[PDB]
Amino acid sequence: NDSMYGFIGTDVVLHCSFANPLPSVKITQVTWQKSTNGSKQNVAIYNPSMGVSVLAPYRERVEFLRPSFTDGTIRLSRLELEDEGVYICEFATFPTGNRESQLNLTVMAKPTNWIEGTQAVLRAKKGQDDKVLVATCTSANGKPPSVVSWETRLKGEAEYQEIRNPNGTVTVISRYRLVPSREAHQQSLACIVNYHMDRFKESLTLNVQYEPEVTIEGFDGNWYLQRMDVKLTCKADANPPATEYHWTTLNGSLPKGVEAQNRTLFFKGPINYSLAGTYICEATNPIGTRSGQVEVNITE
Amino acid sequence: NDSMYGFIGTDVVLHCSFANPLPSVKITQVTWQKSTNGSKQNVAIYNPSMGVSVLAPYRERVEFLRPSFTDGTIRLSRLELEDEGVYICEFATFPTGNRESQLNLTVMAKPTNWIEGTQAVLRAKKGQDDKVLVATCTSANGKPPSVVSWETRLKGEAEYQEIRNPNGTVTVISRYRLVPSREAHQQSLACIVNYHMDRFKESLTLNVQYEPEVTIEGFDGNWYLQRMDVKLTCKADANPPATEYHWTTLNGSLPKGVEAQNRTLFFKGPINYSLAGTYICEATNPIGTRSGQVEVNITE
Numbered sequence: 001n002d003s004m005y006g007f008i009g010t011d012v013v014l015h016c017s018f019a020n021p022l023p024s025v026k027i028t029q030v031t032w033q034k035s036t037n038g039s040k041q042n043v044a045i046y047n048p049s050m051g052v053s054v055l056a057p058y059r060e061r062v063e064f065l066r067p068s069f070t071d072g073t074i075r076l077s078r079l080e081l082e083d084e085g086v087y088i089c090e091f092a093t094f095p096t097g098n099r100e101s102q103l104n105l106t107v108m109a110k111p112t113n114w115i116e117g118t119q120a121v122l123r124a125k126k127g128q129d130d131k132v133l134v135a136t137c138t139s140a141n142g143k144p145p146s147v148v149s150w151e152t153r154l155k156g157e158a159e160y161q162e163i164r165n166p167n168g169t170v171t172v173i174s175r176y177r178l179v180p181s182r183e184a185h186q187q188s189l190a191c192i193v194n195y196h197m198d199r200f201k202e203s204l205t206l207n208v209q210y211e212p213e214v215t216i217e218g219f220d221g222n223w224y225l226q227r228m229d230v231k232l233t234c235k236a237d238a239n240p241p242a243t244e245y246h247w248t249t250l251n252g253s254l255p256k257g258v259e260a261q262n263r264t265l266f267f268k269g270p271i272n273y274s275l276a277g278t279y280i281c282e283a284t285n286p287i288g289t290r291s292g293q294v295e296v297n298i299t300e
Numbered sequence: 301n302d303s304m305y306g307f308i309g310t311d312v313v314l315h316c317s318f319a320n321p322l323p324s325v326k327i328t329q330v331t332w333q334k335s336t337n338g339s340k341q342n343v344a345i346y347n348p349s350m351g352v353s354v355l356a357p358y359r360e361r362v363e364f365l366r367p368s369f370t371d372g373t374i375r376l377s378r379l380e381l382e383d384e385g386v387y388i389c390e391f392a393t394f395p396t397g398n399r400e401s402q403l404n405l406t407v408m409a410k411p412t413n414w415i416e417g418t419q420a421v422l423r424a425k426k427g428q429d430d431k432v433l434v435a436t437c438t439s440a441n442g443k444p445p446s447v448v449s450w451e452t453r454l455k456g457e458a459e460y461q462e463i464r465n466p467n468g469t470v471t472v473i474s475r476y477r478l479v480p481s482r483e484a485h486q487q488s489l490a491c492i493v494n495y496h497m498d499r500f501k502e503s504l505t506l507n508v509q510y511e512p513e514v515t516i517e518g519f520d521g522n523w524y525l526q527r528m529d530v531k532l533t534c535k536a537d538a539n540p541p542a543t544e545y546h547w548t549t550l551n552g553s554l555p556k557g558v559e560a561q562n563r564t565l566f567f568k569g570p571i572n573y574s575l576a577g578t579y580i581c582e583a584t585n586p587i588g589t590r591s592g593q594v595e596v597n598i599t600e
Binding site for chain 1: 345353400
């Protein structure tokens with residue numbers, strides 16, 4: 001049998017006509033019923049002798065379009081989720097008896113879609129390989145369920161959940177998880193939901209806090225004897241930024257003539273051989289502490 | 301819903317009445333249909349304005365008993381196996397619509413019952429422990445199936461088979477088997493078939509052929525010296541009867557003064573000690589050969 005589909009709030013026309021009417025055969029009455037599937041309840045009746053009858057609760061939403069001996073077609077207005085079910089149309093005739101046809105009514109609903117990030121702060125620490133939630137994509141109260149997916153360059157794993165609501169709509173939820181990293185920071189994650197031929201997209205960017213990646217600038221390989229005023233600068237790539245800096249060497253402390261001031265190691269000069277060595281910067285932010293090195297050799 | 305049952309050839313009354321008729325509600329038409337279970341075909345229609353309509357193939361077997369605005373009751377006459385199925389009765393009314401009720405029709409049939417023996421000859425031989433068929437009890441073309449069982453003092457095993465006929469009747473067959481024996485001969489075997497509260501019984505007696513059970517009569521323990529005219533008689537219980545008799549002794553042949561003539565060993569006399577010994581009769585029938593013994597001691 002036929003299947004009709006319509007969205008909540010719209011109207012459907014349910015066709016029902018009597019094929020080959022004969023001079024012999026006479027149409028007595030045309031009857032629409034709804035089977036909520038054992039239960040038959042009467043919806044609307046058309047009797048040529050007595051006119052039209054639409055029963056509650058359909059009195060304001062149902063109507064015959066062109067009620068006649070041959071046409072029992074009706075419009076069901078302002079669809080409701082509960083309109084779903086099987087509809088039977090019956091022509092009672094004499095002396096030949098009953099002729100019935102059936103159809104299925106499915107009611108459809110467009111979902112409400114939205115992405116959301118975690119309220120938690122994302123942290124990237126070595127030794128932390130824990131995958132965590134970074135975003136949730138929801139398609140709520142749709143029918144049939146929509147398809148949810150993700151667009152991103154991030155390398156994570158998505159989990160999917162489908163909730164069957166009491167009213168027959170389905171909520172689809174996807175949860176995106178990854179182990180937070182320095183490279184993930186500021187990067188984008190989009191959730192995509194496909195319903196029929198519609199396509200919804202919403203994006204967000206990740207905020208990921210990570211310990212310092214430190215490098216040392218300043219040594220140009222031309223630190224010649226007697227040169228004046230050279231310095232090393234500790235570059236701490238850190239989110240949030242480093243709060244604290246500490247300089248040391250591989251063999252002990254700093255030499256006389258080398259002064260530390262936060263991220264800078266000043267070599268006032270004149271440069272001499274006793275300044276060669278390996279200089280280390282230890283940088284600290286709220287996430288952790290990391291070191292960086294530079295090997296200084298004195299030239300000329 | 302209701303279930304009706306009737307035997308082939310009988311009539312059933314299928315009830316259908318409209319409960320609480322109101323001044324408001326008006327009955328348009330009463331319709332009987334048969335659902336052979338997807339298919340609805342029209343059986344009979346009653347329309348107050350236009351009268352009665354019974355459709356083929358029901359024109360001579362269906363009739364409304366008291367056709368009115370409230371009563372759609374019909375008689376289905378001379379039941380046929382194919383009448384089985386679901387019957388729907390529908391009151392079309394205005395402005396309230398359709399009211400239907402259903403019922404199941406099951407058609408019943410009494411079986412034809414009979415016992416029968418094997419055409420084979422039953423044989424009892426030592427070393428033959430083969431169970432064989434001795435009787436078959438059939439209950440043919442019944443609906444529902446009848447219960448088949450056996451009454452007998454014999455110690456055998458019954459096998460049961462149920463054949464589902466194309467028309468929906470069931471044939472029940474039971475096969476009785478036993479290893480044939482001398483004691484089974486002439487003994488009775490009855491098959492019993494219960495249908496509803498009826499009880500059918502039919503008996504037969506077994507004919508079993510067996511080799512000879514031989515005993516020796518004639519020695520009275522008073523075979524005193526010089527006694528004249530005594531004899532031994534070989535009694536062969538055999539079916540069919542023994543055809544042949546042979547006498548011998550444990551130690552050789554017969555003594556002078558002892559003459560054999562079929563089942564008789566004549567001791568003419570006078571009796572003397574040389575006549576003591578063990579005398580054997582070997583009796584043969586179409587089934588086998590068996591021996592019998594008697595120890596003769598001479599007295600006084």
